[PDB]
Design a protein around this ligand. Structure first.
Ligand SMILES: OC1CCN(Cc2ccsc2)CC1
Length: 150
């Protein structure tokens, strides 16, 4: 019973989380997941400030109110070559990655690794945080509060 959470650098407190190497997070699960990192879904303003500090991904993820991809450099297979916070407009489907915002993180680029899941609760799942440099932190617990997300 295992969940892998791949996480990025934080930029003005904003970071990306991909679950189990595939788009697999619902909007309700995303809020609960960020809560386990003492974080919240970023506002569009928080995400724009993270972008300005160097944040970009090539994956759709929730923020408050929308699903987006932050882009700095144009790439034809990432958000159809757009730059800025690209907003998903049309999709049949509901599951994506998530972004999270930690207000206590550093103000600019923080590419140190993540070594804790501070606000998960008691549960049976082995949750493993996987950093980009491969370092891992694991703990037994749960973060999902909605039964339909389990
Ligand atoms: O009230 C709930 C809190 C979270 N737990 C999770 C769990 C499932 C098997 S063991 C622990 C269940 C009861």
């Amino acid at each position: 019973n295992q969940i892998d959470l791949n996480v990025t650098c934080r930029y003005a407190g904003v970071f990306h989380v991909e679950k189990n190497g595939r788009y697999s997070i619902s909007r309700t699960e995303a809020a609960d997941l960020c809560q386990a990192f003492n974080s919240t879904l970023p506002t569009m303003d928080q995400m724009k400030l993270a972008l300005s500090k160097g944040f970009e991904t090539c994956r759709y993820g929730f923020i408050e109110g929308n699903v987006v991809i932050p882009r700095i450099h144009p790439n034809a297979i990432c958000a159809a070559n757009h730059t800025g916070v690209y907003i998903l407009v049309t999709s049949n489907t509901s599951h994506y990655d998530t972004y999270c915002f930690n207000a206590s993180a550093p103000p600019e680029e923080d590419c140190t690794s993540v070594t804790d899941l501070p606000n998960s609760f008691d549960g049976p799942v082995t949750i493993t945080i996987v950093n980009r440099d491969g370092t891992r932190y694991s703990k037994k617990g749960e973060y999902r509060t909605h039964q339909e997300d389990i």
